[PDB]
Structure formats: structure tokens, C-alpha cells
Design a protein around this motif. Sequence first.
Motif, mmCIF file in Angstrom:
data_model
loop_
_atom_site.group_PDB
_atom_site.id
_atom_site.type_symbol
_atom_site.label_atom_id
_atom_site.label_comp_id
_atom_site.label_asym_id
_atom_site.label_seq_id
_atom_site.Cartn_x
_atom_site.Cartn_y
_atom_site.Cartn_z
ATOM 1 N N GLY A 1 -55.832 41.941 47.212
ATOM 2 C CA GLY A 1 -56.265 43.416 46.936
ATOM 3 C C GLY A 1 -55.859 44.286 48.209
ATOM 4 O O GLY A 1 -55.785 43.680 49.311
ATOM 5 N N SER A 2 -55.415 45.476 47.839
ATOM 6 C CA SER A 2 -54.821 46.322 48.807
ATOM 7 C C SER A 2 -54.735 47.632 48.111
ATOM 8 O O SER A 2 -54.623 47.989 47.145
ATOM 9 C CB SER A 2 -53.529 45.840 49.527
ATOM 10 N N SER A 3 -54.758 48.545 49.291
ATOM 11 C CA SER A 3 -54.708 50.235 48.858
ATOM 12 C C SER A 3 -53.225 50.397 48.287
ATOM 13 O O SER A 3 -52.195 49.768 48.897
ATOM 14 C CB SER A 3 -55.002 50.972 49.961
ATOM 15 N N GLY A 4 -53.003 51.397 47.631
ATOM 16 C CA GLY A 4 -51.721 51.571 46.885
ATOM 17 C C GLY A 4 -50.604 51.953 48.155
ATOM 18 O O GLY A 4 -51.236 52.290 49.326
ATOM 19 N N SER A 5 -49.372 52.411 47.703
ATOM 20 C CA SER A 5 -48.528 52.635 48.555
ATOM 21 C C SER A 5 -48.013 54.068 48.561
ATOM 22 O O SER A 5 -47.996 54.546 47.329
ATOM 23 C CB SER A 5 -47.285 51.649 48.420
ATOM 24 N N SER A 6 -47.774 54.726 49.634
ATOM 25 C CA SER A 6 -47.140 56.021 49.625
ATOM 26 C C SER A 6 -45.662 56.203 48.941
ATOM 27 O O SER A 6 -45.618 57.282 48.155
ATOM 28 C CB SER A 6 -46.983 56.788 50.932
ATOM 29 N N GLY A 7 -44.874 55.474 49.476
ATOM 30 C CA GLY A 7 -43.427 55.513 49.025
ATOM 31 C C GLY A 7 -42.499 55.594 50.124
ATOM 32 O O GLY A 7 -41.562 54.687 50.509
ATOM 33 N N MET A 8 -42.541 56.880 50.573
ATOM 34 C CA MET A 8 -41.516 57.056 51.762
ATOM 35 C C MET A 8 -40.174 56.914 51.419
ATOM 36 O O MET A 8 -39.605 56.295 52.206
ATOM 37 C CB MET A 8 -41.921 56.260 53.116
ATOM 38 N N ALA A 9 -39.744 57.274 50.284
ATOM 39 C CA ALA A 9 -38.458 57.014 49.779
ATOM 40 C C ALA A 9 -37.818 58.331 49.426
ATOM 41 O O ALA A 9 -38.216 59.242 48.602
ATOM 42 C CB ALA A 9 -38.473 56.177 48.504
ATOM 43 N N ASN A 10 -36.483 58.527 49.959
ATOM 44 C CA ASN A 10 -35.860 59.747 49.936
ATOM 45 C C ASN A 10 -35.196 59.887 48.453
ATOM 46 O O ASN A 10 -34.395 58.970 48.090
ATOM 47 C CB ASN A 10 -34.903 59.844 50.944
ATOM 48 N N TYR A 11 -35.605 60.845 47.910
ATOM 49 C CA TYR A 11 -35.070 60.921 46.294
ATOM 50 C C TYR A 11 -33.728 60.923 46.187
ATOM 51 O O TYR A 11 -33.038 60.117 45.543
ATOM 52 C CB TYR A 11 -35.588 62.264 45.937
ATOM 53 N N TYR A 12 -32.962 61.838 47.004
ATOM 54 C CA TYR A 12 -31.601 61.937 47.269
ATOM 55 C C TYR A 12 -30.884 60.584 47.313
ATOM 56 O O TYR A 12 -29.948 60.223 46.661
ATOM 57 C CB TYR A 12 -31.273 62.695 48.311
ATOM 58 N N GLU A 13 -31.475 59.717 48.247
ATOM 59 C CA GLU A 13 -31.007 58.542 48.584
ATOM 60 C C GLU A 13 -31.250 57.353 47.230
ATOM 61 O O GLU A 13 -30.161 57.102 47.007
ATOM 62 C CB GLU A 13 -32.085 57.737 49.435
ATOM 63 N N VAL A 14 -32.255 57.531 46.490
ATOM 64 C CA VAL A 14 -32.502 56.619 45.475
ATOM 65 C C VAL A 14 -31.385 56.620 44.572
ATOM 66 O O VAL A 14 -30.892 56.116 44.186
ATOM 67 C CB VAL A 14 -33.939 57.102 44.917
ATOM 68 N N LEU A 15 -30.840 58.011 44.345
ATOM 69 C CA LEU A 15 -30.005 58.486 43.340
ATOM 70 C C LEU A 15 -28.413 58.147 43.905
ATOM 71 O O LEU A 15 -27.805 57.413 43.044
ATOM 72 C CB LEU A 15 -30.199 59.629 42.794
ATOM 73 N N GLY A 16 -28.542 58.636 45.024
ATOM 74 C CA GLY A 16 -27.139 58.301 45.797
ATOM 75 C C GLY A 16 -26.318 59.325 45.967
ATOM 76 O O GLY A 16 -25.281 59.467 45.796
ATOM 77 N N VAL A 17 -26.872 60.711 46.084
ATOM 78 C CA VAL A 17 -26.251 62.007 45.926
ATOM 79 C C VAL A 17 -26.548 62.806 47.304
ATOM 80 O O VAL A 17 -27.454 62.319 47.857
ATOM 81 C CB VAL A 17 -26.317 62.891 44.734
ATOM 82 N N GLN A 18 -25.781 63.793 47.298
ATOM 83 C CA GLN A 18 -26.135 64.566 48.583
ATOM 84 C C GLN A 18 -26.889 66.213 48.088
ATOM 85 O O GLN A 18 -26.980 66.371 46.852
ATOM 86 C CB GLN A 18 -24.791 65.214 49.154
#
Length: 92
Positions: A1-18
Motif C-alpha cells: 500500500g502507498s499514497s497516490g502519485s503527483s506526476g511531475m510530468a511536463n505535458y509538452y514533453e509527454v507529447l513531444g512539442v514546443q
Amino acid sequence: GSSGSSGMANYYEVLGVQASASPEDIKKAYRKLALRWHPDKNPDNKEEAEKKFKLVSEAYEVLSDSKKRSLYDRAGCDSWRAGGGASGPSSG
């Protein structure tokens, strides 16, 4: 068991655009991405891919929209802490 994750992921990065990208590039990119990171297309790892599928879709909208995009941009790298620039408190 563990608490949820925040993410800390850059949207722009995920997609791969500027940030200065067009509203059409992100759309076309996403669609193709969805299939690329598609779980069904990836036998080795299905779950791993799934997650990415949701991300590519989530961000796609976050940016696609003007309010979501602007809101995310204005925020900057960090979202939890906004006040992190040039110190200079002044009132009038």
C-alpha cells in the motif's frame, strides 16, 4: 500500500512539442502517439503502454485548450509553488 502519485510530468514533453507549437501539430502528434504508446500494439508490456495512452490524451487537451494551456504555461516548471522568481514585494 502507498499514497497516490503527483506526476511531475511536463505535458509538452509527454507529447513531444514546443510551447510555440501550432494547435494542429499537437493534435496530429497525439493521435499518432496514442497508437505508438498503445498497449494492444505492445505485447511485451500492455499496462506500461496503457498509462502513456492516458497521458498523451490528457495533455493533448490541457494544451489544445486556451485556458488549460495558458494556465499550465503561466504556472511554469513548478505547479505547487508559483512564487519563485525575482524577490521584490511592493504595495501601493
